[PDB]
Design a binder for this molecule. Structure first.
Ligand code: PRO
Length: 207
């Protein structure tokens, strides 16, 4: 899944990791996309000692599934070093260009993150409880930026959750919610917001 070209870049980033991180997949052994995700994550986890992949079979741990709100499949969530749910989730496989999203989520959970303005970080911490779904395709070039911003907010604010959704895996959901444009944010199952958005714009929408 990862060319040595990528591994050169990812090692630069993973060198910055100061805290351990756990990727927890809920694996349905009878679903091909779950097995693909397992193959992807196994290789991804091998990129750094601080990244652990753990596997739980779907429908064996209902208390955990409740705790992490596991609905869409395939599914993987991010846990911090202490074992706590960061609110960061991927529904589908974040392969192709979405590797960017997974890398940034791991970086933000396994480090202190990039220097940020007190103005921005105040607003992030000030945000109320919220659940964000970021709909993407694997070939959408502007999608990872939006995903990474929302999931960075989730990594800082304990009440914000940010779920990447590969919309091409959920065609019925695409019609229902009317995801027409390629990157789309859905907040608390209500307000749709399409197109690229800055951190400050996202924070405002979350306010
Ligand atoms: O990798 C690091 O540690 C530095 C910190 C700010 C930007 N990069």
């Amino acid at each position: 899944w990862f060319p040595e070209s990528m591994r050169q870049q990812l090692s630069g980033i993973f060198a910055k990791l100061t805290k351990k991180v756990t990727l927890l997949q809920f694996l349905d052994a009878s679903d091909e996309k779950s097995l693909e995700l397992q193959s992807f994550l196994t290789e991804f986890a091998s990129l750094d000692q601080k990244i652990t992949l753990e596997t739980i079979l779907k429908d064996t741990e209902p208390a955990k599934e409740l705790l992490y709100g596991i609905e869409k499949m395939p599914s993987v969530v991010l846990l911090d070093a202490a074992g706590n749910y960061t609110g960061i989730k991927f529904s589908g496989i974040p392969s192709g260009h979405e590797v960017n999203s997974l890398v940034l989520a791991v970086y933000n959970v396994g480090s202190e993150g990039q220097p940020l303005e007190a103005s921005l970080q105040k607003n992030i911490l000030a945000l109320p409880k919220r659940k964000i779904e970021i709909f993407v395709s694997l070939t959408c070039h502007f999608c990872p930026d939006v995903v990474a911003a929302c999931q960075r907010i989730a990594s800082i604010n304990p009440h914000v959750e940010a779920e990447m959704v590969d919309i091409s895996l959920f065609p019925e959901l695409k019609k229902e919610k009317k995801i027409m444009s390629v990157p789309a944010m859905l907040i608390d199952g209500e307000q749709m917001i399409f197109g690229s958005k800055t951190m400050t714009e996202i924070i405002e929408a979350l306010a």
